[PDB]
Structures are given as structure tokens and as C-alpha cells.
Scaffold this motif. Structure first.
Motif, short mmCIF file in Angstrom:
data_model
loop_
_atom_site.label_atom_id
_atom_site.label_comp_id
_atom_site.label_asym_id
_atom_site.label_seq_id
_atom_site.Cartn_x
_atom_site.Cartn_y
_atom_site.Cartn_z
N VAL A 214 0.91 -1.12 0.00
CA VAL A 214 0.00 0.00 0.00
C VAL A 214 0.97 1.20 0.00
CG1 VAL A 214 -1.81 1.27 1.29
CG2 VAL A 214 -1.58 -1.22 1.46
N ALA A 215 0.81 2.10 -0.94
CA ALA A 215 1.76 3.16 -1.14
C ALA A 215 1.32 4.44 -0.51
CB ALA A 215 2.01 3.33 -2.61
N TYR A 216 2.19 5.07 0.29
CA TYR A 216 2.03 6.52 0.52
C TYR A 216 3.11 7.26 -0.23
CZ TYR A 216 5.59 6.13 4.16
OH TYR A 216 6.74 5.86 4.92
N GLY A 217 3.11 8.58 -0.13
CA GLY A 217 4.03 9.41 -0.92
C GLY A 217 3.86 9.25 -2.42
N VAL A 218 2.66 8.81 -2.85
CA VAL A 218 2.36 8.53 -4.26
C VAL A 218 2.50 9.80 -5.07
CG1 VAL A 218 0.48 7.83 -5.88
CG2 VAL A 218 0.87 6.61 -3.71
N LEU A 219 2.25 10.93 -4.39
CA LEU A 219 2.30 12.29 -5.00
C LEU A 219 3.49 13.13 -4.46
CD1 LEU A 219 -1.59 13.00 -5.32
CD2 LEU A 219 0.01 11.91 -6.96
N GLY A 220 4.44 12.45 -3.83
CA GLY A 220 5.63 13.09 -3.25
C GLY A 220 5.52 13.49 -1.79
N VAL A 234 10.25 18.50 -5.77
CA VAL A 234 8.81 18.32 -5.64
C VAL A 234 8.44 17.30 -6.73
CG1 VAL A 234 6.56 19.46 -5.59
CG2 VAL A 234 8.56 20.63 -4.79
N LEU A 235 7.84 16.16 -6.32
CA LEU A 235 7.61 15.05 -7.28
C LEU A 235 6.78 15.49 -8.49
CD1 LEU A 235 7.82 12.13 -8.24
CD2 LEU A 235 5.56 11.75 -7.10
N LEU A 236 5.73 16.24 -8.25
CA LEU A 236 4.79 16.53 -9.31
C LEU A 236 5.21 17.67 -10.24
CD1 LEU A 236 1.31 16.08 -7.65
CD2 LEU A 236 2.65 14.43 -8.98
N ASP A 237 6.38 18.24 -10.01
CA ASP A 237 6.98 19.23 -10.94
C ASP A 237 7.95 18.55 -11.95
OD1 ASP A 237 5.48 21.30 -9.57
OD2 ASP A 237 7.15 21.99 -8.41
N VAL A 240 8.85 14.79 -16.95
CA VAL A 240 8.22 13.64 -17.64
C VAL A 240 6.78 13.34 -17.21
CG1 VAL A 240 10.65 12.63 -17.60
CG2 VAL A 240 8.62 11.10 -17.18
N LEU A 241 6.47 13.51 -15.92
CA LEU A 241 5.06 13.52 -15.47
C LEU A 241 4.23 14.62 -16.13
CD1 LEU A 241 5.10 13.01 -11.64
CD2 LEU A 241 5.14 11.18 -13.32
N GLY A 242 4.85 15.77 -16.39
CA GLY A 242 4.10 16.85 -17.00
C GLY A 242 3.84 16.47 -18.43
N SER A 243 4.88 15.95 -19.08
CA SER A 243 4.86 15.50 -20.49
C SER A 243 3.74 14.47 -20.72
CB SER A 243 6.22 14.89 -20.86
OG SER A 243 7.23 15.88 -20.95
N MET A 244 3.76 13.41 -19.90
CA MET A 244 2.80 12.31 -19.99
C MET A 244 1.38 12.74 -19.66
SD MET A 244 3.54 8.48 -18.57
CE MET A 244 5.04 8.61 -19.56
N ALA A 245 1.23 13.61 -18.67
CA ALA A 245 -0.09 14.18 -18.35
C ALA A 245 -0.73 14.91 -19.56
CB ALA A 245 0.03 15.14 -17.15
N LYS A 246 0.10 15.62 -20.34
CA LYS A 246 -0.38 16.34 -21.53
C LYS A 246 -0.85 15.35 -22.61
CE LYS A 246 0.62 19.51 -25.19
NZ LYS A 246 0.94 18.58 -26.30
N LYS A 247 0.02 14.38 -22.87
CA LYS A 247 -0.24 13.25 -23.75
C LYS A 247 -1.57 12.60 -23.49
CE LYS A 247 1.40 8.71 -25.36
NZ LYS A 247 2.57 7.83 -25.63
N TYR A 248 -1.86 12.29 -22.23
CA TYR A 248 -3.08 11.56 -21.87
C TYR A 248 -4.28 12.45 -21.57
CZ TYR A 248 -0.67 7.09 -21.84
OH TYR A 248 -0.02 5.94 -22.25
N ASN A 249 -4.06 13.76 -21.63
CA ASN A 249 -5.06 14.72 -21.17
C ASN A 249 -5.45 14.50 -19.71
OD1 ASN A 249 -5.30 16.21 -23.59
ND2 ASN A 249 -6.70 14.68 -24.44
N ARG A 250 -4.45 14.41 -18.84
CA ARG A 250 -4.67 14.49 -17.40
C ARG A 250 -3.69 15.46 -16.74
NH1 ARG A 250 -9.52 11.28 -16.69
NH2 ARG A 250 -9.56 10.20 -18.72
N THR A 251 -3.45 15.26 -15.45
CA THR A 251 -2.42 16.01 -14.74
C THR A 251 -1.30 15.09 -14.27
OG1 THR A 251 -3.50 15.82 -12.58
CG2 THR A 251 -4.29 17.50 -13.96
N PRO A 252 -0.20 15.69 -13.82
CA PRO A 252 0.89 14.94 -13.20
C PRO A 252 0.37 14.00 -12.11
CG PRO A 252 1.66 17.12 -13.69
CD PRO A 252 0.21 17.09 -14.10
N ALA A 253 -0.58 14.47 -11.30
CA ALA A 253 -1.05 13.67 -10.17
C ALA A 253 -1.70 12.36 -10.62
CB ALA A 253 -2.03 14.46 -9.31
#
Ligand code: NDP
Length: 323
Positions: A214-220, A234-237, A240-253
Motif C-alpha cells: 500500500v503506497a504513501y508518498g504517491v504524490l511526493g 517536488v515530485l509533481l513538478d 516527464v510527469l508533465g509530459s505524460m499528463a499532456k499526452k493523456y489529457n490528465r495532470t501529473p497527479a
């Protein structure tokens, strides 16, 4: 808690929702904040709430859940509530009494899950962080395998439906599983897990032993002072998370969250903001391709946001080992 949830099955037969809302708070927050956030999470469709005696939010989390039950929003049987016994009460004769205490704060009859919070015992007493004059915690020595037997006793008392551990290393998990006369394996090991610290080896190990990670710190992590180096990244900055979020039309989180889901991990999350709490629930709505999963496996960098540095000199600090 029955099979009609997005749930996985624990090695004791019980069901756990794979997306959980965490009830710990930054230092800056009043503890009543947890009542407010729990009501919000319940309305957003959360059924799994994670807490701990040391959080000191269980009384407010219980108010929130109990008022939602009272007013007909949820049933207790469709709520999965976790607590954890803190270092000061790991002695066999103190474990149950701590669980009875939390049940009293909660006004619950049982918790669905009860974990050892850390494999490190501290001097017993009301004070959660007993220190000496140098500001250093007072360790105590406990038989962790005796702590485990007291957990098993809490399960056979009906006080908790399942039992597990948090922040154990590979060697510490082995201890327990190899303990003679073991009655119940830990159902889970709750540990920090994110693209910067992806826990591949411990994940594979837990899987091989039917232990849910069971994971905590999933969002940093919420970066709590002082558990977290305020100068870690800061994990969500992370680009590559920003890149992939754009690709999928979501957010880093959401990308961070979905990454863990597709690994078979049960995921916790906290936000202080309503709209994030609603947003985190969109994790169920989309799939990351397997080449993108490999991309995120590549971010692994041994960045541990919560090393429990205040425990560093403990005979049992779990984080010296590779995993
Ligand atoms: N077992 C253990 O030893 C430990 C367990 N825990 C548990 O883990 C839970 C989760 O906490 P933690 O791991 O610290 O925090 P998370 O890693 O879950 O979240 C980290 C940060 O992400 C932000 N965030 C959440 N949703 C979004 C979103 N949709 N978009 C952008 N940012 C978002 C939050 O900030 P913001 O509030 O600004 O929205 C939060 O500060 C705790 O509440 C507790 O249950 C915590 C520590 C240790």
C-alpha cells in the motif's frame, strides 16, 4: 465490505479498496481539518480511509464517517478504515490497549485494518516522541515478533478485521513470516512509493509472499516539517510527469496515481483541496500504455522523502538496507 468495489483481496480473505484517502495533516493544520476532508472524500466516492494513533486525527475522522453513516450516505460495512499502532505502544501488553483507545476516539466497534506503524519501539508513555535533553528520541527495545503476536490477538478479539505492517524492509518482513507458530501473515506493508522511489524489489517480494503493498508518498508526500527535507525535489513538478499528463489529457497527479494502480499497488492520497480530492478519483477512468509504464519505471532515483531521520540510530531503522 464485499467484492462489488474496485478492491483487491487480502491473504486473510478480506477486501480492500485500491484507492484510499489519507487522514494525516501538515503541522500547520488544525486537527478538525480532517473531519472536513473526510466528509469531502466520502462525498467524492472514497470508501477507504487511512489513519494512525500518532496522527491525532482519528476522533475527527470518526465524527466525519459516523455522521455520513447517520445521515444515510454510507454504511460502516462499506467503509474500510485503517489505523496503526505507534512506536510507544509496540510492547505486547500495550498493543491492544492502544487499539481500544483509538476505537474509543472513533466510536467504532472495529477497524478494518491495523498496522505496526514502524518496526522501531520508543520509550512507553503518553508522549508520542519521548526525547532526552539533546532533543533525541528515547528508543526502547521490543521483540517485533512479540508485537506481531499481540496484533494477531487483536484480530482474534474482533477489534480489527485484518493486520499488517508499515515501513518494514525486506529482512523485517522475513522475520515475521519465518516466525514459528505464525498465525496470520501481514496482509500488507504500507511504504513510500512513487516514480522517484518505485520500490520494484520490495513490490516483487511482497507479491511473492501475498503481501499487498500500500503506497504513501504517491504524490511526493505532503512534505511535513520536519520529516521531509524541504530541499528535496517536488515530485509533481518532474518534467516527464508533465509530459505524460499532456499526452493523456490528465495532470501529473493522475499519472502518478495510475502508474501505481497498474502495478497492483493499493494507493493512498491526501489533498487539503476539495477539487483535487474529486480529481484523484478520475484514476479509474483511463489506462497508461505499457511503453509509458516503462518510461515511469525509469525515473527511479532512490529519492526517499520520509526516511524517518529522527530514528536514524535505531537498531531497526528500516532504510539502511537496499530494500
Ligand atoms: N505509513 C506511514 O508511515 C505514513 C503514512 N502516511 C499516510 O499517507 C497519506 C497520504 O499522505 P502523503 O503520502 O504525505 O501525501 P501524498 O503523497 O498522497 O500527496 C502529496 C501532495 O500531493 C498534493 N495533491 C494531491 N492531489 C493532487 C492533485 N490532484 N493535483 C495536484 N496536487 C495534488 C497534496 O497537496 P495539496 O494538499 O496542496 O492539494 C499533497 O501535499 C497520509 O494522509 C497518511 O494516511 C503518511 C506518511 C507516513
Amino acid at each position: 465490505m464485499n467484492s462489488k468495489c474496485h478492491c483487491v483481496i487480502l491473504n486473510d480473505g478480506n477486501f480492500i479498496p485500491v484507492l484510499g484517502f489519507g487522514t494525516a495533516l501538515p503541522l500547520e493544520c488544525p486537527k478538525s481539518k480532517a473531519k472536513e476532508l473526510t466528509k469531502i472524500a466520502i462525498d467524492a466516492g472514497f470508501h477507504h480511509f487511512d489513519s494512525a494513533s500518532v496522527y491525532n486525527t482519528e476522533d475527527h475522522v470518526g465524527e466525519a464517517i459516523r455522521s455520513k453513516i447517520a445521515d444515510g450516505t454510507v454504511r460502516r460495512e462499506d467503509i474500510f478504515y485503517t489505523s496503526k499502532v505507534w512506536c510507544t505502544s509496540l510492547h505486547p501488553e500495550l498493543v491492544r490497549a492502544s487499539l481500544e483507545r483509538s476505537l474509543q476516539k472513533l466510536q467504532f466497534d472495529y477497524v478494518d485494518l491495523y498496522l505496526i506503524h514502524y518496526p522501531m519501539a520508543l520509550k512507553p508513555g503518553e508522549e508520542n516522541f519521548p526525547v532526552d535533553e539533546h532533543g533525541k528520541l528515547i528508543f526502547d527495545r521490543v521483540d517485533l515478533c512479540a508485537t506481531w503476536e499481540a496484533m494477531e490477538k487483536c484480530k482474534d478479539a474482533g477489534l480489527t478485521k485484518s493486520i499488517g505492517v508499515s515501513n518494514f524492509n525486506y529482512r523485517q518482513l522475513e522475520m515475521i513470516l519465518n516466525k514459528p507458530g505464525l498465525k496470520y501473515k501481514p496482509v500488507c506493508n504500507q511504504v513510500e512509493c512513487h516514480p522517484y522511489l518505485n520500490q520494484m524489489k520490495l513490490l516483487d517480494f511482497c507479491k511473492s509472499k501475498d503481501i499487498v503493498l500500500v503506497a504513501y508518498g504517491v504524490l511526493g508526500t505532503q512534505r511535513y516539517g520536519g520529516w521531509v527535507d524541504q530541499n528535496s525535489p517536488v515530485l509533481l513538478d518532474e518534467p516527464v510527469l508533465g509530459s505524460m499528463a499532456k499526452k493523456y489529457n490528465r495532470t501529473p497527479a493522475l499519472i502518478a496515481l495510475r502508474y501505481q494502480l497498474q502495478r497492483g499497488i493499493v494507493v493512498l492520497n491526501t489533498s487539503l483541496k476539495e477539487e483535487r480530492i474529486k480529481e484523484n478519483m478520475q484514476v479509474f477512468e483511463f489506462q497508461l500504455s505499457s511503453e509509458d509504464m516503462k518510461v515511469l519505471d525509469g525515473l527511479n532515483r532512490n529519492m526517499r522523502y520520509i526516511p524517518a531521520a529522527i530514528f536514524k540510530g535505531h537498531p531497526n531503522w528500516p532504510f539502511l538496507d537496499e530494500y
